[PDB]
Amino acid sequence: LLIRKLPFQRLVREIAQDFKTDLRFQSAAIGALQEASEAYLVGLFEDTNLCAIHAKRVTIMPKDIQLARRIRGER
DNA sequence: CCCGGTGCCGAGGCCGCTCTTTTGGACGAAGACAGCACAAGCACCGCAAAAACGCACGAACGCGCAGACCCCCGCGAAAAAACCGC
Numbered sequence: 324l325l326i327r328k329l330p331f332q333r334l335v336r337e338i339a340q341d342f343k344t345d346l347r348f349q350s351a352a353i354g355a356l357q358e359a360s361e362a363y364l365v366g367l368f369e370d371t372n373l374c375a376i377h378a379k380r381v382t383i384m385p386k387d388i389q390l391a392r393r394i395r396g397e398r
Numbered sequence: 399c400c401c402g403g404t405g406c407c408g409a410g411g412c413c414g415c416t417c418t419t420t421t422g423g424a425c426g427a428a429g430a431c432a433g434c435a436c437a438a439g440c441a442c443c444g445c446a447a448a449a450a451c452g453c454a455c456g457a458a459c460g461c462g463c464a465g466a467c468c469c470c471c472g473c474g475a476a477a478a479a480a481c482c483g484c
Contacts, residue, residue: 327469327470330469347478347479349479349480350479350480382459
């Protein structure tokens with residue numbers, strides 16, 4: 324895993340702090356969340372690279388991300 | 399077969415009416431006219447502009463280098479809570 328394990332834990336807790344106050348986490352929940360997040364982001368970067376190559380470029384730009392999320396059907 | 403007499407049909411008379419042609423001879427000059435405005439389409443010439451391609455150049459990003467930073471790695475401690483049982 325490329326992201327670390329403690330900043331990601333803090334991010335997850337911060338996000339979870341909105342839906343219910345003072346929620347405990349479990350052995351393999353944060354690990355699964357990190358695996359899913361990194362897999363998702365790698366797929367998104369694959370699609371972004373495809374779009375950037377389509378535009379005859381090598382640099383990925385935010386509009387490529389936006390196009391990828393639009394075609395995937397993401398809101 | 400004969401008498402009294404009347405009302406019905408015939409070819410013609412005649413009356414009021416409607417239709418037709420005509421309106422002197424010759425000469426001169428001037429002036430104003432003698433289908434049109436309107437209509438859709440063919441075959442053609444033309445300018446304004448698109449989506450894309452070709453060229454030039456300037457700057458903002460990559461590359462390269464020496465520096466500062468804190469993510470990452472490694473270590474040891476404590477015990478919440480996950481996995482198991484009845």
